[PDB]
Symmetry: C3
Subunit: 68 residues, 3 copies
Amino acid sequence: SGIVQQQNNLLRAIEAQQHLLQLTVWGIKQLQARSGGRGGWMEWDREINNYTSLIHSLIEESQNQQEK
Amino acid sequence: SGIVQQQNNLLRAIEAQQHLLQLTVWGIKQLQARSGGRGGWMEWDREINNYTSLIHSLIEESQNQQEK
Amino acid sequence: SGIVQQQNNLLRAIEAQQHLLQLTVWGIKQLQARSGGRGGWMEWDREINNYTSLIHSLIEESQNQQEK
C-alpha cells in the first residue's frame, strides 16, 4: 500500500493512449486500402490485434485488481 | 508511500510515448493531405485532440501531484 | 514498498504499446517510401529513434531496478 492516485492517473493515460493508437492504425489501414486490398498485411494486422488484445486484458486485470 | 522511481520511470515513458504518437499522427496526416484536403477527418482530428489533451493533463496532474 | 503487480501490469502494457507503435511507424514509413525515397524525413526518423531509444532504456532500468 502506497500511492494509488498516481497509479490510476498513469493507467488512465495508457488507456487513452490505447485509443489514440487504434485511431492511428485505422488511419494507416485506410491509406493502405487506397492502393488495392490489404491482403499482404495479415501478419501486420494479426500482430496489431495480438498486442492490443494483450494490452486491453492487461488494463482490465489492473483495474479490477488493486482494490485494497 | 512506496516505490517512486519506478513510477517516475514509467511516467517518463508515457510522456516520451506521447511524443512518439504525435509524430506518427503528423506522418499520417501529411500522407492524407497528399490526396486533397483532410476535411473528411475532422472527427478523426477532434478525436485525436480529445485524447491527447486528456493525456497531457493526466500527465501534468501526475507530476505536480505526488511530492510527499 | 506497496503495490507491485499493478506496477508490473502497467509496465507490461507500456512495453506492448511500444511494440504496437513500432509497427505503426513501419506501416507509415513504407507508405511514404511508395512515393520515392524517404530522404526528407531524416529528422522525423531521428526523432523516432531518439524517443524509442529513451523508452526502451527507461523500461529496462525499470525492470532490473525494483527487486525489493
